[PDB]
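User: Sequence for Alpha-amylase below. Tokens please.
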Amino acid sequence: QVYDKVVLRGESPLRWDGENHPLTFDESEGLWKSEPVTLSGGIQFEYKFVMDNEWLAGDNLRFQVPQTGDYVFYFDPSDQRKVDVRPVT
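Assistant: Structure tokens for Alpha-amylase:
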């Protein structure tokens, strides 16, 4: 787990401020997960996580969105720059 809270920030429909997209720690998977976020196919989508108020270090994470639809963003405290963004129903 590691942190008390982790939130997702980034380009629209995310924001770079606030806590509109909090993650919840999934105990059975051992990873932090967002709620589903609708993204448009074909874009280079930039985002970061903020963990107990600490910005993820480095360049923004980048996800090349393969198709329009809903995605769940995952954060692994042990592999913090991984791009794990899972398409969902």
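The two ends are 26 Å apart (CA to CA).
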